[PDB]
């Protein structure tokens, strides 16, 4: 047998069609899994964008991408040091409601 979703299965999201540099510059950090998208899935977006991925909390750390199974520990750090939370769906209207910029040279056929 085979349980779990095999690959990404993309289809049960919606991925806004915002600009190519608005999270460039910003740092993210994925905890936990995800139904929408994998850790994986989710980060290559936010890379996608030119945010930043990693799986820790640190003084840079712009927001924490929670999710499920997740530990109480990463929110605390988090605020302290100032780091706004939100789940799978806030980093999605990010994509929307953060600006864009003009990168020095532009990738022709970009589309999935």
């Given at each position: 047998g085979s349980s779990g979703?095999?690959?990404?299965?993309?289809?049960?999201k919606e991925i806004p069609k915002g600009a190519?540099?608005?999270?460039?510059?910003l740092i993210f950090v994925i905890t936990g899994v995800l139904e929408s998208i994998e850790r994986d899935e989710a980060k290559s977006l936010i890379e996608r964008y030119g945010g930043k991925v990693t799986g820790n909390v640190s003084k840079?750390?712009?927001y924490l991408v929670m999710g499920r199974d997740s530990g109480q520990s990463k929110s605390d750090k988090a605020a302290a040091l100032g780091t706004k939370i939100i789940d799978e769906d806030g980093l999605l209207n990010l994509i929307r409601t953060m600006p864009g910029k003009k990168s020095k040279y532009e990738i022709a056929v970009e589309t999935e």
């Open positions: 979703s095999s690959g990404k299965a993309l289809g049960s190519e540099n608005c999270l460039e510059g840079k750390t712009n």
